[PDB]
Structure formats: structure tokens, C-alpha cells
Amino acid sequence: RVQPTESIVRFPNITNLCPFDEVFNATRFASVYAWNRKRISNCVADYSVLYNLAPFFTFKCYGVSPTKLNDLCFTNVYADSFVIRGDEVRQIAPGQTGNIADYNYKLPDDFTGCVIAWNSNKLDSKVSGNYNYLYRLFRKSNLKPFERDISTEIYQAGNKPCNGVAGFNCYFPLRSYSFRPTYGVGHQPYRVVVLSFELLHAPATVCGPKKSTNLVKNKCVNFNFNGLKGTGVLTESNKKFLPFQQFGRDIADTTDAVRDPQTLEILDITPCSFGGVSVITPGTNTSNQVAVL
Amino acid sequence: KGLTVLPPLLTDEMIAQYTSALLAGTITSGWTFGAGPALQIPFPMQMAY
Amino acid sequence: AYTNSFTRGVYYPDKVFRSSVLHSTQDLFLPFFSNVTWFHVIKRFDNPVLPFNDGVYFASIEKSNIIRGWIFGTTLDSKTQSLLIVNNATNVVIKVCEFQMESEFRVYSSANNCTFEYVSQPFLNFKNLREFVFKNIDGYFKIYSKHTPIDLPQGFSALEPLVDLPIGINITRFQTLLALHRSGWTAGAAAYYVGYLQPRTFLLKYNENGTITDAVDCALDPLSETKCTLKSFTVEKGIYQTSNF
Amino acid sequence: NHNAQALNTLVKQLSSKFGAISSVLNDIFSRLDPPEAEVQIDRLITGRL
Ligand SMILES: *[C@@H]1O[C@H](CO)[C@@H](O)[C@H](O)[C@H]1NC(C)=O
Ligand SMILES: *[C@@H]1O[C@H](CO)[C@@H](O)[C@H](O)[C@H]1NC(C)=O
Ligand SMILES: *[C@@H]1O[C@H](CO)[C@@H](O)[C@H](O)[C@H]1NC(C)=O
Ligand SMILES: *[C@@H]1O[C@H](CO)[C@@H](O)[C@H](O)[C@H]1NC(C)=O
Ligand SMILES: *[C@@H]1O[C@H](CO)[C@@H](O)[C@H](O)[C@H]1NC(C)=O
Ligand SMILES: *[C@@H]1O[C@H](CO)[C@@H](O)[C@H](O)[C@H]1NC(C)=O
Ligand SMILES: *[C@@H]1O[C@H](CO)[C@@H](O)[C@H](O)[C@H]1NC(C)=O
């Protein structure tokens, strides 16, 4: 049998990727209390760009390895974007207790996701200072995991009725967050986006980009065209498939032709040459010379 | 699939030559070729026998 | 009203290309010569909720594209997500959401949440016949369509796959969407036929180009069973053992 | 015809699962762990033999 010289993997041109870049580079990020939610589906996700960029220094991933994130397939990916101070960045972790964590964004202990935080002092800080960002400071009970509260009702800290007026014992729950360039790194604003990965009964719609290799023809090579795995010799084929049709089979039901995903050309697959070996020999007593068929 | 057809040792042309030899003997030698060396006989006399 | 399916409703089961071969396939197919409910819209207007069951074959004989789209949902209410397919001249919109030239489109008042959305080039005397097969298997909704220039015509056509969508929703009922045109509203004559797919075994004849040219339903009649057993459309004279009653 | 029928039957029998999860050896190996893979493969081997 002729063993396969090389292995070639062919997959369709990468397309339809969800706008991770847009959410990461969004000009304005929502306040932590009103954290935005992004739904990712029917897309191919490449995380190489996020890792490559210098600004995204923090890439802490819990429950899954970031390197194999592309390899692993997740039905739905959820992206939430909020800006928080450096001191409280630690609080956004599984099983971590903090003011931001308890009253703004809550992560369950069993959370499979990667949290991405990048310091963005220039964008979020002004010489005058930026008071647009707000954080919840007063809440009756700790927030449940992945729960968003936007209530502006005046907090009641006293027996006397609040009356809807923020008097003594009544304080507005949201507190303005102050950012300046001169402020220390801990006080300095950090943009944080956490990606949550989940698996559902419905077929996964989000998966990492599929790698491809150069086509090899007229040689015996292992082939993986669109998930069809076989060992064969690939040749140009006269036969023309219908547009929907991807691969072809003979009467025996063995695959005989495949259409390349990247280039729509039908290629015949022929099994690598194999045959029986027969030794033609005169009697051993007469001679030891042999001929092989 | 590992299933192979092995060619016959005697080719069709060779079989035809054997058949031709049998026909030639029967027409010219009658039944003698079967029982021994071919013996010439006229075909009408062979039919008479 | 009811009509005869004849040989219509055959679709390509898989993407595999087969040339000059006859293949037996077990799949959900419309039974040959099955009885199909017929709805006529002109004054007559028909828009009933019809159970999806395992699968549905929809054929519309229409002029001026009065037929517009289809709604598929378990309950057809905001409580449960419902697949929506609609068609306009520019494009066709496929949307999965919780749902409770003409410038008026009133398919849904509001959408609570949308799991999935899709857009594509439009799918669409009566000179046009539109054949659509709808199935939900393994969380994938499959649409197969053939358009032929023209009861249902007695001819054989194979429905090429149009799109496969990972809706991942449970569909038990479906309702057609029809367009009312104001000259209050006058509607041109429209015919839409609904049929239900059943598990069946079919022998499919493939030409050199790979198009299906003829089909046989094994269970339809005894001769068809004989053809299925022998895997040949032509049957020679004789007695053939086909099945055990 | 009889020879052709027998060869065709043998090749078609290759597709038969024989009670295994899959008829493709590679798919069985990837999907299942080695002990489970062995039992399913043994079913395929027995049927093909
Ligand atoms: C961000 O901008 C850089 C600019 O060089 C670009 O290379 C990258 O693809 C963009 N997106 C992300 C997610 O890094
Ligand atoms: C895929 O990309 C290549 C360029 O690398 C292009 O030549 C080819 O036409 C593309 N195929 C499809 C189906 O888009
Ligand atoms: C279809 O059903 C109707 C009753 O609803 C019946 O009268 C008719 O004969 C049926 N047609 C066929 C072809 O079975
Ligand atoms: C068709 O529908 C889409 C989605 O609602 C819309 O964007 C497009 O403009 C419509 N085309 C028309 C109304 O011609
Ligand atoms: C769908 O919308 C309802 C109403 O706003 C909301 O309560 C529910 O959580 C949504 N479902 C999903 C899966 O987002
Ligand atoms: C779909 O819902 C119906 C009830 O409306 C139920 O009987 C059926 O089992 C459901 N199917 C699936 C696949 O969940
Ligand atoms: C197949 O297509 C060829 C053209 O490529 C045509 O000559 C031939 O008649 C077609 N055969 C059938 C059965 O459609």
C-alpha cells in the first residue's frame, strides 16, 4: 500500500464573524450599573486579535483555556461592556465579593468565561473630568448572578418615610464616578468586557474559525474537505455537480468526487494504489533467486 | 475495497487457437485425432462413416 | 376541498451527487397520490392555522405574488418563540422572535426578544407554480423549493434545497400569510395547497447530471414494491416475492 | 451476474453498522474512549469477517 505523503485540510472561506471588534472598540461604554448585553450567534469567533493588541493587558479566563477558545465550540456567547476603576477590577471574578460585584455586576461561582479588562485613561478621562459614568452604591440586597438593576428610587436608610426626597437617611442610589488624567492608576478608569460561553440543546451557532491548507493534487494525501475525512489521490474531474451538491458517491456508495469549499471545482478522489505481492521463485533447492509480481 | 479479479492464464485468443486446432483436425482428420495421430480423410467419406 | 398530489413533492434528501444510478432512501416524503387540502382565495378568503406535524409541503399557484410568507410556531403567541418568514420585493426576511408595492406590513405588533435573524434574495392566467417543503429535524429548519412555469400539475419535479436554518425551536402549528390589496381590499385569485409528509421509502432515479428524474413510492402499490425490491423501474415478466403480510 | 452480485453484496455490507454506533472506524475511534471503542469495533469486525 502507498502511505499518504501529506495531510491537507480544506474549509470554507472565513466569513460572517460577529462584531467583537466593534464592541471592543465602541466609542462609549455603558456605566457599570446599567451593563450592556450583547448576543453573539451564527458567527465565527477569532480571539487572536484581542490577544495580539497591546492595550488589552488583562485576559483572565475561568473554566476554559483562552488558547483553546477557538478550538472549543459554544452555542451562545454573551458580551457585557462596562467601565470600572482599577481597584475594583478584581471584584469582577467568580466567587469575589466587592461593592461593584455585590451591587452592580454579579458573577456566579460556576462561570465559564474570560474577562477582558484594558486601562483606558485617555478615552474615559478629561481635564475637566468625566462624571457620565455612575455606579450603584446603595441596595437592599446583593444582586443575583447576571442580574441588572436600573432603579433610581431613593434609598431608604431610616424609619421615616423616604417621601421620594433625598433628605437625611435618603440618598440617591447611583453615585457619580469621577475620572481625571492626573488620578492614580487604581482610580484610573479601566474598560472591562466579560465573555460568557454557554452550551445549549440547539445546535451551536458560534464556533472558532476553521484552518485551511494548500491543495495537493496528483499525490496520495490525507484529505479533510468540509469535515469529510479520507485518504486519497485528488484529480481534476470532468463531472459537473449541481450547485447545492457538495460531494459525490459511486454505486458502491464510496466517495468518488468532492468539491473544494474555497474554490468550487469538483475533484475526483481515487484510492491510493494497493495490490497483492506475489513472489515467483524456483525451488529453494535449485536456487535462491526470486522475482516479485 | 481489497476485492480483486485475477486474469485468466489462458487468453481468449489462445483458447480460440485451441478451438481452431480441434476444428481443423475434425474437418480434415475426422475422429482420428482424438484416438491418435491425425489421419487425413476426405470430409464426404468421414460423413459416410 | 381536497386534491390529488400525483408525483409531486419529491425533494433531494442529501447533498451527495449520484450519476446514472437508482437509490433507495428512507425519509419523510409526501406520499404519492395523497389527498391534499386545497384553499382558494379571491368573495373567499382562507387563512387557517394548520398543524405542522412531522412536515409540510406547500404549493401555491399564484399570479402577482399575492402569497407572501409563512408563520411557524408551537402556540403562535408571544409566550413562545415563533419562526417568521416574510417576502418583499427587495429581500426575504427570516426572523425568530416572540410574536404576539405595498407600504403596509402588519405581521406582528411587537417582538419581545429575537434569538435569530436572517436575510436573503427573495424566494419568489396563472403562470407561476411555487413548491416549498418545510421540515424541522435536529433543531434545523429546512426549506426546499422549486419554481415551475405553468389542480396540481401532473408532472415530476425535484425540489432543490434553498436554505437550512438553526432555529432550534419547537414547531407544532403553521399559518400562511396573505396580502390584501386596496384599489376595502380586493384580492386576485390565489390557490395554495397544503400536504403532510410521512415516513416513506422511495427509489430515486438520478440522471448523469445528478438531477432526480423519476421516483417510485414502494408502499403505494404492489408493482411499486416489486420495483423497490428489484431496484429497477422496469420489471420483467415473472413472479417476485416482495414482502410478508 | 452471480459473481457481480456477490461482489456488490460484499461492498454494500461494508456500510452496515452491525449494531455499532457507526460504520466508519475513524468516527468510532474519535467519538468514543478506547474501551468503548474496542467493543464497538469488535462488533464491526465480527460482522465483516
Ligand atoms: C483593534 O484595532 C487594531 C488596530 O491595529 C486592529 O488591528 C484590531 O483588529 C482591532 N480589533 C481588536 C479586537 O483588536
Ligand atoms: C475564497 O477566497 C478566495 C481567495 O483566497 C477566492 O479566490 C475564492 O473565490 C473565495 N471563495 C468563495 C466561495 O468565496
Ligand atoms: C380526499 O378526501 C375527501 C374527503 O375529505 C374525499 O371525498 C376524496 O375522495 C379524497 N380524495 C382522495 C384522492 O382520496
Ligand atoms: C423588506 O424588508 C426589510 C426588513 O424589514 C427592509 O429592510 C426592506 O427595506 C424591505 N423592502 C421593501 C419594503 O421594499
Ligand atoms: C424574551 O423577552 C421577555 C420579555 O421582555 C424576557 O422576559 C425574556 O427574558 C426574554 N427571553 C430571553 C431568552 O432573552
Ligand atoms: C413541542 O410541543 C408540543 C406541545 O405543544 C409537545 O407535545 C412536543 O413534544 C414538543 N416537541 C419537542 C421536540 O419538544
Ligand atoms: C445533462 O446536461 C448536459 C449538458 O451539460 C445535456 O447535454 C444533457 O442532455 C443533460 N441530461 C439530462 C438527462 O438532463
Tab-separated table of N, CA and C in Angstrom, chain C residues 3 5-6 11 23 27 39-40 50 58 70 86 89 93 107 127 138 155 158 165 176-177 180 206 210 221 231:
chain	number	residue	atom	x	y	z
C	3	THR	N	-57.377	17.621	-3.108
C	3	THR	CA	-56.789	17.445	-4.433
C	3	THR	C	-55.840	16.246	-4.410
C	5	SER	N	-52.188	14.684	-5.085
C	5	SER	CA	-50.785	15.091	-5.157
C	5	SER	C	-50.106	14.661	-6.452
C	6	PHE	N	-50.458	13.491	-6.975
C	6	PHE	CA	-49.800	12.875	-8.141
C	6	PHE	C	-48.364	12.558	-7.730
C	11	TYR	N	-38.078	15.646	-3.092
C	11	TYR	CA	-37.004	16.582	-2.809
C	11	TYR	C	-35.689	15.829	-2.680
C	23	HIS	N	-31.293	4.970	-6.316
C	23	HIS	CA	-31.002	4.886	-4.891
C	23	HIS	C	-32.273	4.826	-4.056
C	27	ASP	N	-36.975	8.444	4.116
C	27	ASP	CA	-37.030	9.818	4.591
C	27	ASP	C	-38.483	10.258	4.649
C	39	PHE	N	-56.974	25.349	-0.599
C	39	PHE	CA	-57.577	26.601	-0.166
C	39	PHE	C	-57.582	27.603	-1.315
C	40	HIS	N	-58.742	28.211	-1.582
C	40	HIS	CA	-58.913	29.161	-2.677
C	40	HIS	C	-59.191	30.548	-2.117
C	50	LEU	N	-52.895	25.530	10.604
C	50	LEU	CA	-52.799	24.132	10.242
C	50	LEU	C	-51.653	23.447	10.970
C	58	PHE	N	-45.909	22.765	0.815
C	58	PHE	CA	-46.749	23.894	0.437
C	58	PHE	C	-46.551	24.192	-1.040
C	70	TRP	N	-44.920	32.735	5.492
C	70	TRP	CA	-45.440	31.725	6.400
C	70	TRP	C	-45.000	32.006	7.829
C	86	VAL	N	-41.038	36.201	5.843
C	86	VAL	CA	-41.799	37.156	5.047
C	86	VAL	C	-41.013	37.538	3.802
C	89	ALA	N	-40.237	42.708	-2.217
C	89	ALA	CA	-39.519	42.685	-3.489
C	89	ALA	C	-38.010	42.754	-3.296
C	93	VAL	N	-37.042	38.119	4.595
C	93	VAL	CA	-36.599	38.242	5.974
C	93	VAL	C	-37.073	37.025	6.744
C	107	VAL	N	-47.450	42.056	10.196
C	107	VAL	CA	-47.275	40.679	10.642
C	107	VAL	C	-47.321	40.593	12.166
C	127	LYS	N	-49.214	31.791	-14.252
C	127	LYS	CA	-48.031	31.319	-14.954
C	127	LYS	C	-46.930	30.840	-14.016
C	138	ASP	N	-33.701	17.761	14.181
C	138	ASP	CA	-32.488	18.021	14.962
C	138	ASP	C	-32.240	19.517	15.130
C	155	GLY	N	-46.894	16.256	-13.156
C	155	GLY	CA	-45.536	16.235	-13.667
C	155	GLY	C	-44.575	16.011	-12.523
C	158	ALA	N	-38.123	17.927	-8.874
C	158	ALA	CA	-37.346	17.702	-7.662
C	158	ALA	C	-37.014	19.047	-7.034
C	165	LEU	N	-31.629	26.472	8.346
C	165	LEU	CA	-31.508	27.442	9.413
C	165	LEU	C	-31.467	26.753	10.767
C	176	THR	N	-50.304	30.478	7.064
C	176	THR	CA	-49.852	31.235	5.910
C	176	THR	C	-50.124	32.724	6.089
C	177	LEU	N	-49.339	33.538	5.386
C	177	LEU	CA	-49.503	34.988	5.369
C	177	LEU	C	-49.908	35.438	3.975
C	180	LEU	N	-53.465	41.677	1.279
C	180	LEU	CA	-54.712	42.294	0.842
C	180	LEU	C	-54.388	43.607	0.140
C	206	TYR	N	-31.551	8.918	-10.759
C	206	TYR	CA	-30.662	10.048	-10.975
C	206	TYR	C	-30.099	9.998	-12.391
C	210	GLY	N	-27.072	14.361	-12.352
C	210	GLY	CA	-27.376	14.228	-10.947
C	210	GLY	C	-28.744	14.711	-10.536
C	221	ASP	N	-48.259	0.822	-4.180
C	221	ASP	CA	-48.959	-0.244	-4.883
C	221	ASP	C	-48.031	-1.445	-4.997
C	231	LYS	N	-34.933	-2.933	-7.370
C	231	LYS	CA	-34.183	-1.696	-7.579
C	231	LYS	C	-34.148	-1.319	-9.057
